[PDB]
Design a protein around this ligand. Structure first.
Ligand code: 04C
Ligand code: MG
Lengths: 240, 235, 222, 212, 231, 231, 195, 244
């Protein structure tokens, strides 16, 4: 078997392969996560250099891991499929042994552990992917939003963004998001998410994807017209 | 390139020495040992204000009588903790007793040098292991990726370690109470931390024979922070 | 077809006092109707004030004692010369026995010593690792003869206070080392009379805080 | 063995005998057949003795690892399923285990699971397990109501083991009582059948088959 | 799982004041057929130990090769191979005992009963038994097969306990062994007249005697015995 | 230079630089002394601390009741090698009922270290060991180097400034070799020997580490107030 | 375990499964549900060797649920039954085979048709209008041969099923403590609480 | 040891790119252009053979277009040998699915698994990636007619019309210009050929330098037919559209 230690320390104490995997994440299309009072919303950028696409069959950016948890990402698309698959398998395995679906923290901790393993295993390179994992624990109404990255560290976020120009949208969220009072409703949360993406995206046509997750396995993806209404509303208020 | 398990001309392993540089970049972690207990404290260091700081888990339980604080590439610590927990529980299963703090530390340090061309690189994280047993009482251990461990009366690791260690040299004596040690960790953390110390960006914990390993609440730590500021102004 | 087990006979006996404990065993070793040895000890000092015997199939018995003695040695190496407590020894032995659950050690095991409060302790095991602490246990071929006698004389079973109309039980009390040895000697002489695999000699190992002492007594050789 | 545990208004009662056998030889009269897994979980033991003792002790180690990893006490369902999946891996090898995982959690409430070495796992309100299970069932079923008091429920459990201890030749010694509430398990003493039988016979007026 | 084919019968032995004596006949039986007559079943190891083996001969030959190889291995990087670090009887026994018990545990035993006789470096007599089951025991007298049933009773009249060992000379001890070999020839249907005997003394060392014969036999009374009852 | 990338490469002058760099790790280690008479063998070790708040790194390790060593260099490597010795001593006891010869102990360490210097991927051990023991041929002292070279000596020292103690022992050779039946005097000579390697620091109560093995003395280690006698 | 029945009618599949769990001379439980929902429109009942039954049912359940999440799509009853058959077909030549017999009742949403599959532990699959496993079939098949019609309603199917349970309660040696009945149709799976 | 000679095929650049994947894509950009166009009533697959010789046997040849099963086909761009390894795997995977579920494999599932195999070669094993890009053209009863593409990175996406290989930039601009959603197969046939005819590096587009295929529901009632065009059939369709 191929054994080479690809991820290793450098004189200054850095693991360059892990840090270069972060650059792949920085290249990826922007993804944003904002959690409200009774919901979480995952927003995703789709680059518009690709026309003549078939959006029916093209892989969606947000993936269901179980009926109650979702996973979006930024970075290498092929790499993300491997993490999603493993996560989906662990979700079913947890239901089988514990007789209870995974918590969002547990599912995140597993995905983060897989990513970490690939940073000190021989013959493999790290995942060029950072994920946003969102959902609701079984029989719980408290919203959960977690982030993971190639190194394997994970943490909980009131709101967070990853991908290209993420530092711009993080700047936006840092001043626009109030800890004392999060978005009280679904509409407020979606709007703040769309607003944050409109700082970076370009046009609000078929470039923005929005997915809303609510308690007790209530997940739905918004259509073009539904999203376009938020884009139309925000721009009219902006001209002031 | 070059081998992973190569010696330098000075007689040190390159990869082990480079992992020590990674640990210097990590957030500060301090431990102090007394006859009334061992205190463990860490700098959380949130990268952004949107990050929910209570999800930052840099102090960890291994067993009821053993606790652990970390510094460096903290993702690497997960498998070390998992091993420590299994070692502690497995020993209880085989011998119907609590496992010695030293024996636990030694078991964790056996993983350290199991790398080469086993895992592909050394761990990029240092651990402070604190605990109590009937034989050697309250103990504090510093476990490195070199596979070496030292017992300490007090110890600081991370970015502000050399400055904090010099401070611990002057302040520590053999008659320190637990309350005195708690304040001392908070005092020294506030000195070396970049951002201003409060209950949200710094965490305290302790291990006592009676109550075992306990991570302090943000409400409890906040009162100790307030008690500390008043005592420094009082002279 | 090859049969990997045999029966080497003999019998063992453990009694616990207040500040001491005894582990006795006859020195006869047999196969079928032949005597192999009149003096082959099967009660051993294992260190840390723990005495042990594994009676039944001697090959399995010796193998187990050998492994446990070795377990005590590595316990010292791995845990800074810490004394192995009798309760910890018992749990360790359970794992040794249960490790061969599907190809068992054909032995009834007994260990004796002092607990961590300094009081006498006897632990006994089945062949596959189930164990229990007791004041009293006989093991081996003549266990069925000796055990009920111990129930009566050590734990005062079925004995009531005279003139109380069978309402007040005889009160439990610790026995002196002199009284315990009397019961051990009578137990083995009685067993020797009625069991063909028991006889030749009796070796007792007494365990106090001062250490492990030995005593030997002749038994009938027929 | 005879072991039982039943659900009722005031939580769970668990009662077991203390006899160990090797054929018709009485190996012990003072065996502990209840293992205290944690302050909220109990496990009963019936069948092979090393099998029960070893694997239910191992079981407690797995649950300790769960609460260390998950920062939360394990559920009764998950606990019983760890054991059922364990014995299922050994199915056919000849393990002998008749077990009842009894406990309380917030999400479940008072819960009892029957698990055996065949791989059978069943949630239920009443179970009796062991060589004398039928004798226990006879008394327990004919006197059981959901609205029993803690005092009456404790006695019925005690009396059901006594019934089996008497009739079943492979049950006896003493009765160990437990009561599981929302606050955890509570031990209700060891009761020697040597004294308990005559005490019950006199006070209750039962056991008229015996020469008084 | 085996069945023994070519077999050797009794091995007998005892202790005396200064050392030990061991003996075994020179027969290799093939069931009821007395097939091979030049078989040596006593195998010396060094100048201080003799291993006597009964049971399967193919397995006996395997054990010979192991002991032969043990002497070679002990000599490697050992300047004191013929002095302080020479092979002791207790070392040789413990090795075989380990092998015998390992093989029985793998359900593929060496179908033998073995007696290791010798003298230790401090002068102490060594005499211990081990067999296909890995069962071990020691006694002033030891014997395998029919020897256990017929020789031991006779040898125990000379040395009945430990305190009888200093009182027993080599002349008395050898006389008992030679007598026991005669009784076995009378009564064991898989025994032969020819045998080997070995003495290991703490002073005179190893004395290996080959081509001994059972003699002074009582057969004369047979002529008077007529029929089975009324003849 | 170009020939020190791994242990599998020879230099143009026939040197193994990775082995030499491993040898360098020993020179950085704290001083430890070994010496023996005919009755006893003694290890004396100067322990090192990280700072005043830290403990003093334990240098001496027990291998069996009759054997043990002191270390200088990478401590984890000493733990691996000492563990291997514990197993080899233990194998000798269980299988052959035989205490492992101190000379064989050295041979086994040599061969284990050698395999690491000839194969790709692995590395040499980064520690030097001083093994003492009492076996069937009296007291012994060995010096292990991770190149594979093991040497039996009357006395020696390894670590930083070990040349001072090694010179002293070379002068004192005739005196300390005849300290028979006197443990305390043989230790005194070892404590005086290690003192020749001291600079600025002196021997304190939690600094000094002594171990002894002999005729009627199991391998035992002395630390703390037990070594106050010798300061 | 013991009694599991299945009846396919015009617009639904009805599964009836006994509630008793017996070991030795003791009925340990009288409210046992011998079924698992594999997907919203697919239900599997099971009977056979203790332990094996549930372990197999839940293993299949996990696999089908995994497929559903991966493709965001529900497998057809035919597809699920073929997957189940293959797993049992593998099992029979294993070291220790699953000794489990199953009925798979499902509603195919693309065809708008109910479907009932009978699969034994050997991996023997058949699509049927009505099915049974174990000794039940020796009574129910002939009964259904007489009374069954292909164009029956769900209510007519339940009465037809009551006729089977009555016959079994009359002539079967063992007390199986009644049955749990479940209906599979275009709207999914629901349980009849009063039977 | 052998470390000296390891190229390290599965590592990141400082910019966060996979060297070998990028260089494999550079290889594919010199391969003969392949176009896929998806219509409402079928799919067209067109591909340009790499500089043909007059003595090449044209009728009994297969370079670009391959059949995976009765409902799915692929157009190849890159190393043919590499593609055939992946094609045989894809053919087997389809049969495994049919054996398991008694249903023809959904197009995406087949595409994902083949793309997952490519991904593996970029993350572990130390081997070079497959120098191949596929255009998948297929039909199933869930999504109907589908076009996909996969590349050495193991990343796949869905399309209405797409090109791979040489001159994709120019080809994609032309397809983006003339393509519309209500398009028929016969129109898509014409678009595919016109696009190749303009993007070709050759002097003039002829029958002998082309491979062509359609996937229609043009069989009899509710069933799909794969038509791998014969030389004479390509000659006729080229005249019918007025290119020659
Ligand atoms: C009553 C007494 C009926 O046996 C109970 O089931 C009791 C439960 C129990 C639980 C924990 C601790 C002690 C007792 N069971 C026994 O006493 C048990 C009965 C039994 C024997 C053998 C079996 O074969 C698998 C199954 C059940 N007794 C024992 O286990 C006795 C003490 N030990 C042995 O029989 C030793 N055997 C066990 C099987 O392997 C060979 C050696
Ligand atoms: Mg007799």
């Amino acid at each position: 078997g191929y054994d080479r230690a690809l991820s290793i320390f450098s004189p200054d104490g850095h693991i360059f392969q892990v840090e270069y995997a972060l650059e792949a994440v920085k290249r990826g299309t922007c993804a944003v996560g904002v959690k409200g009072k009774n919901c979480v919303v995952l927003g995703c950028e789709r680059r518009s250099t690709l026309k003549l696409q078939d959006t029916r069959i093209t892989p969606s950016k947000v993936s269901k891991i179980d009926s109650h948890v979702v996973l979006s990402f930024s970075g290498l698309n092929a790499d993300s499929r491997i993490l999603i698959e493993k996560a989906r398998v662990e979700a079913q395995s947890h239901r089988l042994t514990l007789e209870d679906p995974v918590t969002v923290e547990y599912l995140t901790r597993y995905v983060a552990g897989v990513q970490q393993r690939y940073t000190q295993s021989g013959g493999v390179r790290p995942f060029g992917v950072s994920t946003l994992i969102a959902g609701f624990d079984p029989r719980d109404d408290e919203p959960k939003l977690y982030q993971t990255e190639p190194s394997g560290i994970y943490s909980s976020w009131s709101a967070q963004t990853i991908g290209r120009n993420s530092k711009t949208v993080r700047e936006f969220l840092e001043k626009n998001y109030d800890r004392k009072e999060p978005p009280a409703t679904v509409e407020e949360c979606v709007k703040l998410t769309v607003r944050s993406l409109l700082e970076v995206v370009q046009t609000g046509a078929k470039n923005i994807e929005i997915t809303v997750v609510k308690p007790d396995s209530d997940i739905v993806a918004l259509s073009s017209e539904e999203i376009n209404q938020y884009v139309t509303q925000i721009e009219q208020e902006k001209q002031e | 390139d070059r081998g992973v398990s190569t010696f330098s001309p000075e007689g040190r392993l390159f990869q082990v020495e480079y992992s020590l540089e990674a640990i210097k970049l990590g957030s500060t972690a301090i431990g102090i040992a007394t006859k009334e207990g061992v205190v463990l404290g860490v700098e959380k260091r949130a990268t952004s204000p949107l990050l929910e700081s209570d999800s930052i888990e840099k102090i960890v339980e291994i067993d009821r009588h053993i606790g652990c604080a970390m510094s460096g590439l903290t993702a690497d610590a997960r498998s070390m903790i998992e091993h420590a927990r299994t070692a502690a529980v497995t020993h209880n299963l085989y011998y119907d007793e609590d496992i010695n703090v030293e024996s636990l530390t030694q078991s964790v340090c056996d993983l350290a040098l199991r790398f080469g061309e086993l895992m592909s690189r050394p761990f990029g994280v240092a651990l402070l292991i604190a605990g109590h047993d009937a034989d050697d009482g309250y103990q504090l251990f510093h476990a490195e990726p070199s596979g070496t461990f030292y017992r300490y009366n007090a110890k600081a690791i991370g970015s502000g370690s050399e400055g904090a260690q010099a401070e611990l040299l002057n302040e520590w004596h053999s008659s320190l109470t637990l309350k005195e040690a708690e304040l001392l960790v908070l005092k020294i953390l506030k000195q070396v931390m970049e951002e201003k110390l409060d209950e949200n960006n710094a965490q305290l914990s302790c291990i006592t024979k009676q109550d075992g390993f306990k991570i302090y609440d943000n409400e409890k730590t906040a009162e100790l922070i307030k008690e500390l500021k008043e005592k420094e102004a009082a002279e | 077809q090859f049969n990997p087990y045999g029966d080497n006979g003999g019998t063992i006996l453990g009694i616990a006092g207040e500040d001491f404990a005894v582990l006795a065993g006859d020195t006869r070793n047999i196969t079928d109707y032949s005597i192999n040895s009149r003096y082959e000890p099967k009660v051993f000092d294992c260190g840390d004030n723990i005495v042990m015997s594994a009676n039944g199939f001697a090959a399995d018995g010796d193998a187990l004692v050998k492994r446990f003695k070795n377990s005590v040695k590595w316990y010292h190496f791995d845990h800074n010369d810490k004394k192995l407590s009798i309760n910890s020894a018992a749990r360790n032995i359970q794992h040794l026995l249960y490790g061969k659950r599907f190809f068992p050690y054909y032995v009834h095991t007994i260990i004796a010593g002092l607990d961590e409060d300094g009081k006498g302790a006897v632990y006994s095991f089945d062949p596959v690792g189930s164990y229990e602490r007791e004041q009293c246990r006989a093991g081996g071929a003549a266990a069925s003869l000796i055990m009920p006698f111990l129930d009566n004389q050590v734990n005062f079973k079925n004995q009531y206070e005279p003139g109380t109309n069978g309402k007040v039980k005889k009160p439990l009390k610790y026995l002196s080392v002199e009284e315990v040895i009397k019961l051990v000697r009578d137990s083995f002489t009685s067993a020797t009379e009625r069991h063909i695999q028991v006889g030749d000699g009796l070796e007792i190992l007494i365990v106090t805080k001062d250490g492990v002492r030995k005593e030997f007594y002749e038994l009938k050789r027929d | 063995t005879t072991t039982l545990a039943f659900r009722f208004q005031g939580g769970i009662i668990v009662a077991v005998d203390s006899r160990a056998t090797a054929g018709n030889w009485v190996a012990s009269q003072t065996v502990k057949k209840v293992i205290e897994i944690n302050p909220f979980l109990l496990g009963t033991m019936a069948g092979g003795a090393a099998d029960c003792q070893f694997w239910e002790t191992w079981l407690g180690s797995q649950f300790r690892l769960h609460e260390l990893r998950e920062k939360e006490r394990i559920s009764v369902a998950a606990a019983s399923k760890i054991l059922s999946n364990l014995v299922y891996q050994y199915k056919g090898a000849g393990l002998s285990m008749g077990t009842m995982i009894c406990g309380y959690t917030r999400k479940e409430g008072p819960t009892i699971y029957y698990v055996d070495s065949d791989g059978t796992r069943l949630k239920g309100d009443i179970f009796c397990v062991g060589s004398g299970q039928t004798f226990a069932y006879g008394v327990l079923d004919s006197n059981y109501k959901w609205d029993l008091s803690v005092e009456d429920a404790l006695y019925l459990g005690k009396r059901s083991i006594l019934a089996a201890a008497h009739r079943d030749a492979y049950s006896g010694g003493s009765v160990n009582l437990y009561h599981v509430t929302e606050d955890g398990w509570i031990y209700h003493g060891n009761h020697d059948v040597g004294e308990l039988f005559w005490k019950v016979k006199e006070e209750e007026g039962s056991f008229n088959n015996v020469i008084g | 799982t085996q069945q023994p084919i070519v077999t050797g019968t009794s091995v007998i032995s005892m202790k005396y004041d200064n050392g030990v004596i061991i003996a075994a006949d020179n027969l290799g039986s093939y069931g009821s057929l007395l097939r091979f007559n030049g078989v040596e079943r006593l195998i010396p190891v060094g100048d201080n130990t003799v291993v006597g083996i009964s049971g399967d001969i193919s397995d006996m030959q395997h054990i010979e090769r192991l002991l032969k190889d043990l002497v070679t291995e002990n000599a490697y990087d050992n300047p004191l191979a013929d002095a302080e670090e020479a092979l002791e009887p207790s070392y040789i026994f413990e090795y075989l005992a380990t092998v015998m018990y390992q093989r029985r545990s793998k359900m593929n035993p060496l179908w033998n009963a073995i007696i290791v006789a010798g003298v230790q470096s401090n002068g102490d007599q060594f005499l211990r038994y081990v067999n296909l089951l890995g069962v071990t025991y020691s006694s002033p007298t030891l014997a395998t097969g029919f020897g256990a049933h017929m020789a031991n009773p006779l040898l125990r009249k000379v040395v009945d306990r430990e305190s009888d060992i200093p009182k027993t000379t080599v002349q008395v001890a050898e006389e008992a062994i030679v007598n026991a070999m005669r009784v076995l020839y009378y009564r064991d249907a898989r025994s032969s007249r020819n045998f080997s005997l070995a003495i290991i003394d703490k002073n005179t060392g190893l004395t290996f005697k080959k081509n001994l014969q059972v003699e002074n036999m009582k057969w004369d009374f047979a002529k008077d015995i007529k029929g089975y009852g009324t003849q | 230079n170009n020939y020190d990338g791994d242990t599998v490469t020879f230099s143009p002058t026939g040197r193994l630089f990775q082995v030499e760099y491993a040898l360098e790790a020993i020179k950085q280690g704290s001083v430890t002394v070994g010496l023996r008479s005919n009755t006893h063998a003694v290890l004396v070790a100067l322990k090192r601390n990280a700072d005043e708040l830290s403990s003093y790194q334990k240098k001496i390790i027990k291998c069996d009741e009759h054997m043990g060593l002191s270390l200088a260099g990478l401590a984890p490597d000493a733990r691996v090698l000492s563990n291997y010795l514990r197993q080899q001593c233990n194998y000798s006891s269980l299988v052959f009922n035989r205490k492992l010869a101190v000379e064989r102990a050295g041979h086994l360490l040599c061969d284990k270290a050698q395999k690491n210097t000839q194969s790709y991927g692995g590395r040499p051990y980064g520690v030097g060991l001083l093994i003492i023991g009492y076996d069937k041929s009296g007291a012994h002292l060995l010096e292990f180097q991770p190149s594979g070279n093991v040497t039996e000596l009357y006395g020696t020292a390894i670590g930083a400034r070990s040349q001072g103690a090694k010179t002293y022992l070379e002068r004192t050779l005739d005196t300390f070799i005849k300290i028979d039946g006197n443990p305390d005097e043989l230790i005194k000579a070892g404590v005086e020997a290690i003192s020749q390697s001291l600079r600025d620091e002196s021997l304190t109560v939690d600094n000094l580490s002594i171990a002894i093995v002999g005729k009627d003395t199991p391998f035992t280690i002395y630390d703390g107030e037990a070594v106050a006698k010798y300061i | 375990m013991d009694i599991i029945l299945g009846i396919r009618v015009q617009d639904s599949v009805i599964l009836a499964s006994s509630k008793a769990v017996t070991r030795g001379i003791s009925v340990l439980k009288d409210s046992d549900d011998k079924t698992r929902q594999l997907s919203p429109h697919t239900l599997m009942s099971f009977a056979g060797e203790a332990g094996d039954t549930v372990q197999f049912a839940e293993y299949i359940q996990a696999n089908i649920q995994l497929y559903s999440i991966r493709e965001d799509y529900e497998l057809s009853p035919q597809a699920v039954s073929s997957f189940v058959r293959q797993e049992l077909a593998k099992s029979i030549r294993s070291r220790r085979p699953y000794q489990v017999n199953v009925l798979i009742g499902g509603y195919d949403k693309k065809k708008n048709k109910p479907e009932l599959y009978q699969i034994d532990y050997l991996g023997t699959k058949v699509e049927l209008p009505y099915g049974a496993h174990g000794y039940s079939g020796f009574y129910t098949f002939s009964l259904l041969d007489h009374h069954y019609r292909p164009d029956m309603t769900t209510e007519e199917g339940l009465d037809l099923l009551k006729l089977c349970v009555q016959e079994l309660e009359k002539r079967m040696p063992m007390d199986f403590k009644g049955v749990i009945v479940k209906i599979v149709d275009k709207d999914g799976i629901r349980q009849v609480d009063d039977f | 040891g052998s470390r000296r000679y390891d190229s390290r095929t599965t590592i990141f650049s400082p910019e966060g790119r996979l060297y070998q994947v990028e260089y494999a894509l550079e290889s594919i950009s010199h391969a003969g252009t392949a176009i896929g166009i998806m219509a409402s009533d079928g799919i067209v697959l067109a591909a340009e053979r790499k500089v043909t010789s007059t003595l090449l046997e044209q009728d009994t040849s297969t370079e670009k277009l391959y059949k995976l099963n009765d409902k799915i086909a692929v157009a190849v761009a890159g190393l043919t040998a590499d593609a055939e390894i992946l094609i045989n795997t894809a053919r087997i995977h389809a049969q495994n699915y049919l054996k398991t579920y008694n249903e023809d494999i959904p197009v995406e599932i087949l595409v994902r698994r083949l793309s997952d195999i490519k991904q593996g070669y970029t993350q572990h094993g130390g081997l070079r990636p497959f120098g191949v890009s596929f255009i998948y053209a297929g039909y199933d009863d869930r999504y109907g007619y589908q076009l996909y593409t996969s590349n050495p990175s193991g990343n796949y996406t869905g399309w209405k019309a797409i090109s791979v290989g040489a001159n994709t930039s120019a080809a994609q601009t032309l397809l983006q210009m003339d393509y519309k959603d209500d398009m028929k197969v016969d129109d898509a046939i014409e678009l595919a050929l016109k696009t190749l005819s303009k993007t070709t590096d050759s002097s003039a587009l002829t029958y002998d330098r082309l491979e062509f295929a359609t996937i229609r529901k043009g069989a009899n009632d509710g069933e799909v037919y794969q038509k791998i065009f014969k030389p004479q059939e390509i000659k006729d369709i080229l005249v019918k559209t007025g290119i020659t």
